[PDB]
């Protein structure tokens, strides 16, 4: 979609705040929001591409200034409602309870070994997105290609600053899960993935470093040939 999260090329966002050191997790709630990602993933809330689209639908001012892991909370709730796994009135009534009883205990529960095994498996074996396809890559290194001008309203990885731009295919990576379907609940429908090189001048006009380039990854449908 065309949301504020797509910040590449934006001006006026402010200088970088970079403390000399910061902990991994700044508060207990951050650990919780973090662990909730494998938990809702295993449970069918969403996958990786759908997770991202949930954040992409946040209120823009909250996205820009809220703590990062709060975005994850937003996306969990988003897909909890979407899938019926989360009832909102129950959630709002309980928030009120923990506002007024911040030290009340959490629900009684059994520990589950399979959730730890799940955790360990994912962390160390990864969740690979590459896939085999019956079609051969349409493009190759050195091909000149132009980036699609389409502006779909669902999830995609089509940064506005590359749309309609021209570049050179750098590497073909194999085929991977396609965000434009995956992120919209339409399945993996894997496509070939390529890195494409865009000069800063192509990207920014005269304001572009004549000696700088941006490398951007494009799924096959994003790019049509210019020169081979």
């Amino acid at each position: 979609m065309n949301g504020v999260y797509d910040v590449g090329g934006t001006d006026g966002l402010g200088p970088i705040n970079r403390p000399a050191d910061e902990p991994v997790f700044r508060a207990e709630w951050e650990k919780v929001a973090f662990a909730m990602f494998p938990a809702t993933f295993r449970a069918g809330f969403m996958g990786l591409d759908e997770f991202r689209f949930g954040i992409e639908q946040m209120n823009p001012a909250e996205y820009l200034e809220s703590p990062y892991y709060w975005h994850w909370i937003r996306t969990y709730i988003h897909h909890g409602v979407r899938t019926g796994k989360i009832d909102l009135e129950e959630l709002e009534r309980r928030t009120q309870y923990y506002r007024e009883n911040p030290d009340a205990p959490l629900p009684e529960h059994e520990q589950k070994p399979e959730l730890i095994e799940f955790v360990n498996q994912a962390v160390y074996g990864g969740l690979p997105a590459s896939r085999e396809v019956d079609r051969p890559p349409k493009f190759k290194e050195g091909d000149v290609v132009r980036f699609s001008t389409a502006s779909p309203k669902g999830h995609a990885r089509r940064a506005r600053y590359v749309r309609g731009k021209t570049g050179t295919v750098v590497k073909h990576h194999g085929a991977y899960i396609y965000p434009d379907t995956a992120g919209n609940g339409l399945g993996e429908c894997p496509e070939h993935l390529y890195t494409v090189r865009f000069t800063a001048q192509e990207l920014w006009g005269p304001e572009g470093d004549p000696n700088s380039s941006v490398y951007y990854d494009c799924w096959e449908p994003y790019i049509e040939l210019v020169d081979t």
Partner: protein, 203 residues
């Protein structure tokens, strides 16, 4: 920046805390979340997975030219040799800084980062100030924010990780370290050095 609309940081935390605990309580009763499973996640990325893993690859490539080749031809496979990899580094492509070329990595559309070698991204990498300006003005931002001067005549390549491919910079080995053991070289290898926002430590 200042926003006359924004509550205090303390009132924000109190709200977020209640909301997360209420959400937590619901997934606990669904049977999909447990305390042990939160703790494990936190232990792994607080103590186990971090940029010390990347520094090990770097110092190997700096001292083993044949491994350096393998790392550059296929990154995931090369890192696997050292027992390094997994979640959010399933596809890993390392890019080598030279006297002719400097590399710097960003995720402008979200917060993609190669966890198995760098652990979780620092907050500045996920935030819009860095993400929005590095693709547009890499050279200035590197001096201005990191006091890192790329001579005007050297190319800077910005790698925007829009896919599940994870880009990692192989920083140049500092001069003065000829004959150093892998352990001693590692101390020069920084998280920042493998993002491309800095070189490895001088001296």
């Amino acid at each position: 920046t200042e926003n006359i609309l924004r509550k205090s940081d303390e009132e924000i935390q109190k709200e977020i805390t209640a909301r997360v605990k209420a959400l937590e309580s619901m997934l606990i009763e669904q049977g999909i979340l447990t305390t042990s499973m939160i703790d494990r996640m936190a232990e792994i990325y607080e103590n186990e997975v971090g940029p010390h893993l990347g520094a090990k690859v770097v110092v190997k490539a700096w001292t083993d030219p044949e491994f350096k080749k393998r790392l550059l031809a296929d990154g995931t496979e090369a890192c696997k040799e050292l027992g390094i990899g997994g979640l959010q580094g399933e596809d890993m492509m390392w890019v080598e800084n030279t006297d002719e070329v400097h590399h710097v990595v960003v995720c402008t559309l979200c917060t993609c980062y190669p966890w198995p070698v760098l652990g979780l991204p620092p907050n500045w990498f996920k935030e819009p100030q860095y993400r929005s300006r590095v693709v547009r003005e890499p050279r200035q931002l590197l001096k201005e924010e990191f006091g890192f001067e790329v001579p005007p005549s050297k190319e800077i390549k910005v790698w925007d990780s829009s896919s599940e491919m994870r880009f990692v910079v192989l920083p140049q080995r500092p001069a003065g370290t000829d004959g150093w053991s892998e352990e001693e070289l590692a101390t020069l290898v920084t998280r920042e050095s493998m993002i491309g926002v800095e070189p490895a430590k001088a001296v």
